[PDB]
Design a protein around this ligand. Structure first.
Ligand SMILES: [Cl-]
Lengths: 104, 104, 104, 104
């Protein structure tokens, strides 16, 4: 069973950075062989929220956020938090680096 | 006095096409020597709406829109209506062609 | 076995509408119980291109495009062509309507 | 004479945040009665670059950037540096705050 990544992308300007970060993370995760679920947030709201079970099963959590989100749900997980710009422009490296991220 | 252009940009996805079309139109109008006022319509709302006096004084109206907007206000003006994609990727030509656009 | 949908999203402004349409189609196809493969075309290039076998096995082809793409590879399939804006904002209905789309 | 503001906007994801922040700053500066010049930096390159004279005459420099830019040209000026997201969503306060920003 391929390891699982979960991610949240959140930019409170329109929808573009939220969705670009999500889709680039999804494409790069799959290229590297991982399963991926992404929750997205904008200024209006939240779509496809991570479930408790999804977070439980994940090897890593990647947060590509330009606003504060709830992070208590990720306690005990390795969490790699970056801006949406970095997630969009450095996606390959961010996926790889997330597996060495500190436990939150 | 330089001739005046008024424009509306309107895309019902987030804010990016609305603002990219607006800024590209503004930059190209100024490059060609024209005065420009742009009303924008996106997910944050309608901003900087054209006034009746601005429309009265304009030489042309450019509509870069992917949704319906109020158009009765442009009766009697030359109106050049295009998609946001065309306004963004063909900005120089759209400015030039607007002066030959049909009277609405 | 779930029926299969294939899609191409293609907006020639950056990558935002291409990726937003792709994610909206992916999530909504899955919600309706379908298997889904989306090829994307944007400024970054073409990604996750449909294979000949994927097109062969699909029940329908959804083209969410704001530019012409060669449709020869979809001959003999039902093809539902819509703008990226409509695919992003009307996704549930577009997936349902695609099964009644004309054969190309 | 109205006091002068100069700004640079620079988000290295396409052109959207660069242009949205530029238009927000331009419109809000004008609303507050200031003269405003904005240089933009995006995937298309640098547009409407500030001149030495414009920087000399400015009361404040606002940098709405999501990457490092060379700041030597702003020495001796009050410089207020914020992200593009904050410039877009908090424009009124950022313009007012810039006049108390530290001299660079
Ligand atoms: Cl957007």
């Amino acid at each position: 069973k391929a390891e699982k990544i979960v991610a949240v992308t959140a930019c409170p300007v329109g929808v573009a950075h939220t969705y670009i970060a999500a889709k680039k993370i999804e494409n790069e995760a799959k290229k590297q062989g991982y399963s991926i679920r992404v929750e997205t947030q904008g200024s209006i709201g939240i779509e496809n929220a991570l479930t408790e079970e999804e977070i439980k099963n994940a090897s890593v959590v990647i947060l590509a956020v330009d606003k504060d989100i709830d992070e208590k749900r990720f306690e005990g997980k390795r969490v790699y938090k970056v801006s949406t710009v970095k997630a969009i422009n450095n996606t390959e490296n961010i996926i790889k680096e997330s597996f060495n991220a500190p436990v939150f």
